[PDB]
Amino acid sequence: ISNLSMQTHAARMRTFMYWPSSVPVQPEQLASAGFYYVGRNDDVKCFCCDGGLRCWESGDDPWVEHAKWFPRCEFLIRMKGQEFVDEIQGRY
Ligand SMILES: CN[C@@H](C)C(=O)N[C@H](C(=O)N1C[C@H]2CCCN2C[C@H]1C(=O)N[C@@H]1CCCc2ccccc21)C1CCCCC1
Ligand SMILES: [Zn+2]
């Protein structure tokens, strides 16, 4: 999938068709946080920073996971703010 083709929410949403129903995080929450489905298991990537996340757990918040593992993402920073990211990185 072309990263440029995934710049808008609606485009990201349509990538989730065969997304496993057993995974306790929903496409809407993933797509909102910049993620699209790469078509394997529960693997997703961010359209902006190309960071990959998998093995979603109950209670996971995709924005928090985005900040935990890919804190330099500019989409993340513009949406949630550097302060949010700093705190998730343990900078208070
Ligand atoms: C519990 N919440 C989940 C979202 C989580 O934290 N997942 C971790 C993760 O996705 N990570 C871990 C971090 C550590 C440093 C960078 N990693 C990014 C990410 C990951 O494992 N990404 C893989 C490897 C790189 C290629 C790729 C491509 C698509 C999707 C995932 C990944 C990890 C996945 C394997 C089981 C343990 C938890
Ligand atoms: Zn990102």
The residue written with tokens 């083709």 in the block is: 5
Q: Structural domain of residue 86, as residue ranges?
A: 1-92
The answer to whether 34 and 76 have CB atoms below 8 angstroms apart is yes
Q: How many domains, the chain?
A: 1
Amino acid at 31: A
Amino acid at 60: D
Measured between alpha carbons, how far is 77 from 19 in angstroms, rounded to an integer?
Answer: 27
Task: Report the DSSP pairing between strands 52-53 and 44-46.
Answer: antiparallel
The answer to whether 6 and 15 have CB atoms below 8 angstroms apart is yes
Q: Domain holding 10: CATH number?
A: 1.10.1170.10
> Hey, what are 13's tokens?
């949403």
> Taking the CB of residue 15, how many other CB atoms lie within 10 A of it?
21
Measured between alpha carbons, how far is 85 from 31 in angstroms, rounded to an integer?
Answer: 19
- Whether residue 48 is annotated as binding a ligand: the answer is no
Residue 21 CB partners (closer than 8 Å, separation 6+): none
Could you tell me if the CB of 49 is within 6 A of ligand 1? no
Could you give phi then psi for residue 45, rounded to 5 degrees?
A: -130, 150
Print the SS3 string covering 5-69. Answer: HHCCHHHHHHCCCCCCCCCCCCHHHHHHCCEEECCCCCCEEECCCCCEECCCCCCCCHHHHHHHH
Closest CA to 35 of 75, 81, 89: 75
Could you tell me if the CB of 43 is within 6 A of ligand 1? yes
Could you tell me if the CB of 63 is within 6 A of ligand 1? no
